[PDB]
Amino acid sequence: AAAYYVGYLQPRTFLLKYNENGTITDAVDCALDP
Amino acid sequence: FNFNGLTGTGVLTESNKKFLPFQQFGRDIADTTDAVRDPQTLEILDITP
Ligand SMILES: *[C@@H]1O[C@H](CO)[C@@H](O)[C@H](O)[C@H]1NC(C)=O
């Protein structure tokens, strides 16, 4: 009938980007790749 | 000025920014306050040195 998902969080560093209105529209996960 | 306990000096001017309901202050790349919401008129002001 329905479905749901479950994922855990870890302490990491992220680089966010705010657009002209102040909304977050992109991000980068430092130390996820080289 | 003294906006909800925050003191400083500058020139206040009307702004065109739209704060979300849970936000009160705005900062720049230098970590300094440039915008504020008046706690009575609920309008947004710009701070300039
Ligand atoms: C974001 O700001 C621009 C101008 O800076 C405006 O044209 C646009 O409508 C704004 N976005 C929203 C969702 O209001």
Side-chain angles (χ1 to χ4, degrees):
Chain A
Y4 62 81
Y5 316 84
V6 166
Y8 308 94
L9 328 162
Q10 288 141 57
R12 336 252 327 198
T13 308
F14 266 48
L15 176 75
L16 313 157
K17 168 145 99 175
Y18 300 80
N19 75 7
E20 61 184 1
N21 315 106
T23 287
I24 305 183
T25 51
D26 216 332
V28 175
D29 183 352
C30 322
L32 142 102
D33 272 331
Chain B
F1 56 83
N2 183 327
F3 274 93
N4 276 352
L6 179 69
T7 66
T9 306
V11 176
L12 301 172
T13 295
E14 292 181 354
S15 188
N16 53 307
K17 304 181 211 197
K18 316 299 262 161
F19 285 21
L20 282 174
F22 59 90
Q23 294 165 326
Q24 183 82 14
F25 307 109
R27 297 194 207 159
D28 46 4
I29 62 170
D31 202 358
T32 44
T33 310
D34 291 331
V36 71
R37 180 197 271 141
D38 200 72
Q40 292 193 7
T41 318
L42 261 53
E43 75 190 339
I44 313 290
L45 302 175
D46 283 351
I47 310 174
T48 309

